[PDB]
Amino acid sequence: PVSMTKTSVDCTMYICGDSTECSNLLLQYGSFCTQLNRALTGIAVEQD
Amino acid sequence: ALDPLSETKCTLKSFTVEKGIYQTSNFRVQPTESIVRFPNITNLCPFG
Numbered sequence: 007p008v009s010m011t012k013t014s015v016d017c018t019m020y021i022c023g024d025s026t027e028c029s030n031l032l033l034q035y036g037s038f039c040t041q042l043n044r045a046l047t048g049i050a051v052e053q054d
Numbered sequence: 055a056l057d058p059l060s061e062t063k064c065t066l067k068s069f070t071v072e073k074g075i076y077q078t079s080n081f082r083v084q085p086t087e088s089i090v091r092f093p094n095i096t097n098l099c100p101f102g
């Protein structure tokens with residue numbers, strides 16, 4: 007094996023769907039969503 | 055929110071953006087109308 011499928015998950019849409027109240031509550035946890043998106047992007051680049 | 059370049063700048067927390075492609079946000083189609091579909095019954099409940 008050389009590479010695997012490049013997947014990207016939207017943290018905000020996955021956790022909260024399309025709800026603004028849930029997004030406001032999600033902002034209380036800091037930058038977890040940013041870290042998760044960053045890690046997935048790094049994996050995607052590493053596959054190429 | 056001024057333009058995609060400024061959104062890229064404000065996502066990276068920097069005033070200078072190097073050459074490359076950056077994930078900034080997500081496009082989503084907003085709804086237009088509200089639809090309610092309830093049964094044709096009208097007889098009030100015998101709560102009284």
Ligand SMILES: *[C@@H]1O[C@H](CO[C@@H]2O[C@@H](C)[C@@H](O)[C@@H](O)[C@@H]2O)[C@@H](O[C@@H]2O[C@H](CO)[C@@H](O[C@@H]3O[C@H](CO)[C@@H](O)[C@H](O)[C@@H]3O)[C@H](O)[C@H]2NC(C)=O)[C@H](O)[C@H]1NC(C)=O
Binds near residue numbers: 102
């Ligand atoms: C408890 O009972 C009262 C009184 O109801 C009267 O006596 C009952 C034993 C039954 O025989 C009823 O048929 C009778 O009216 C209830 O009050 C009544 O509720 C109805 C339904 O909303 C009222 O009807 C409306 O009245 C307005 C203004 O007059 C008009 O838009 C129409 O006439 C519409 O139908 C009715 O006026 C009202 N009756 C009295 C005397 O106020 C009461 O609702 C019930 N309790 C609960 C929890 O529902």
Ligand SMILES: *[C@@H]1O[C@H](CO)[C@@H](O)[C@H](O)[C@H]1NC(C)=O
Binds near residue numbers: 094095
């Ligand atoms: C509501 O009632 C019946 C079904 O119970 C339906 O066929 C009819 O077309 C409806 N009427 C209206 C005004 O939508």
